[PDB]
Ligand binder design. Structure first.
Ligand SMILES: O=C(COc1ccccc1P(=O)(O)O)Nc1ccc(C(=O)NCCCOCCOCCOCCCNC(=O)c2cccc(NC(=O)COc3ccccc3P(=O)(O)O)c2)cc1
Ligand SMILES: O=C(COc1ccccc1P(=O)(O)O)Nc1ccc(C(=O)NCCCOCCOCCOCCCNC(=O)c2cccc(NC(=O)COc3ccccc3P(=O)(O)O)c2)cc1
Ligand SMILES: [Ca+2]
Ligand SMILES: [Ca+2]
Ligand SMILES: [Cl-]
Ligand SMILES: [Cl-]
Ligand SMILES: [Cl-]
Ligand SMILES: [Cl-]
Lengths: 227, 229
């Protein structure tokens, strides 16, 4: 399977909702070492989002059951063991994505748009590791997530317009990092509100649907977190 | 791996929407050789329905895309080879289930209700093989589906009330077999209509678990509406 063929396969897999197949294809395209097109970048992101997402969803159910059963040490041990099984799958997915980002995607990123996208992505996957991390390793994983988001944030602020969907998307995920991982709701609200207001101010420079959708998500989090 | 632990793992897997895991647990439960409870056979059924379902849905997308490629032999060979990969996964799942049905489930079925349930299931999984079958094998696959359903149909008419959810569910799936596999719309409609009408008549003449029965009745009528253009 050569590049164009692997991309058409990934697109078939997407249509079939066979996301592990989709991820395998785009991993192989990425490993050929050439900078990904915008289309290929999105295919990779969609694939791994769904692959990791399935495990995250499962983890939340099994972790919720574990702690909603007071006593009954046979059933709690089972849920704990199944959570751990799911965690191993999730960690290996995140480490595969994070290895692709270090080796290929971030160093080859020749546009600010691309570099911000991949650094945001690095922040996300370290955040998914942080969701599942045990106390000892957690602080290091959380700092790795924060630094990836922060570098992405610096670059988008300098290079991209406030209405750009990748700049707005970064503000959404980084604000979520602050609220959910760092337990810093004031910082989360400040980041979200600033991104929203700066986008509102610069509505002259737009081209659209994605941008205003993310702005709505930002304000929804503000109202949720304010109450 | 004791029976009770495996059942609780299957329930965890179900909540996690990890249906391969769920099917593996219930496969192991079934292979211990003891007759399954109502709860256990439903867990087995739900697990495998979802496991095969994923591949069936994927097959319909990739098969459609293969037919939609008018003039592109490179993209069409790709779609065909991916369909074939999906088909082999699908057949292996169906044959797993059908093997559990022959070896353990149908032999140990001590009640008419469970006999009908497992024969319907046999009909379903041969029907899924029939959906994916090429001309050579298809006639034999289709006949095994029909014979499984037909035996289930006869036992259900003799032993169960018209409003029993298993009897109604059989009528639904058997009518779908006639419509989609044998292309016999008139037989599909008549089977589905008499099942609906006989259930409606039984509500007047005296039913316990309304919900499942009445839901299947709605699905029977929906098919009758769809199949009459
Ligand atoms: N711009 C569009 C951003 C919309 O983000 C919210 C959409 O999330 C639900 C769609 O997920 C369907 C794919 C399979 N599931 C997942 O990936 C998944 C599984 C468990 C949890 C989540 N995440 C959430 O429910 C919400 O999390 C977020 C909300 C806002 C921004 C980012 C996230 P994130 O997924 O990165 O933690 C996703
Ligand atoms: N009460 C009985 C309801 C009968 O409807 C069964 C359809 O289940 C909905 C799908 O939920 C399972 C999630 C995985 N996907 C599937 O199982 C799946 C995938 C593709 C097609 C189907 N089935 C259908 O679209 C409809 O086919 C049927 C219609 C009526 C009765 C039975 C079927 P069946 O799936 O056996 O061919 C199910
Ligand atoms: Ca998959
Ligand atoms: Ca699964
Ligand atoms: Cl897959
Ligand atoms: Cl998948
Ligand atoms: Cl699974
Ligand atoms: Cl699944």
């Amino acid at each position: 399977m050569d590049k164009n063929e692997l991309v058409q396969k990934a697109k078939l897999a997407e249509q079939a909702e066979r996301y592990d197949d989709m991820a395998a294809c785009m991993k192989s395209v990425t490993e050929q070492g050439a900078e990904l097109s915008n289309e290929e970048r999105n295919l990779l992101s969609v694939a791994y989002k769904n692959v990791v997402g399935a495990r995250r969803s499962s983890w939340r159910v099994v972790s919720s059951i574990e702690q909603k059963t007071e006593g009954a040490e046979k059933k709690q041990q089972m849920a704990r063991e199944y959570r751990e099984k799911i965690e191993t799958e999730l960690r290996d997915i995140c480490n595969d994505v994070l290895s692709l980002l270090e080796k290929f995607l971030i160093p080859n990123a020749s546009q600010a748009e691309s570099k911000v996208f991949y650094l945001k992505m690095k922040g996300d996957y370290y955040r998914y590791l942080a969701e599942v991390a045990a106390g000892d390793d957690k602080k290091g994983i959380v700092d790795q997530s924060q630094q990836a988001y922060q570098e992405a944030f610096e670059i988008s602020k300098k290079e991209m317009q406030p209405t750009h969907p990748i700049r707005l998307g970064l503000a959404l995920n980084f604000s979520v990092f602050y609220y959910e991982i760092l337990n810093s709701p004031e910082k989360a609200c400040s980041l979200a509100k600033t991104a929203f207001d700066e986008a509102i101010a610069e509505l002259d420079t737009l081209s659209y649907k994605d941008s205003t959708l993310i702005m709505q998500l930002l304000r929804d989090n503000l109202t949720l977190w304010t109450s």
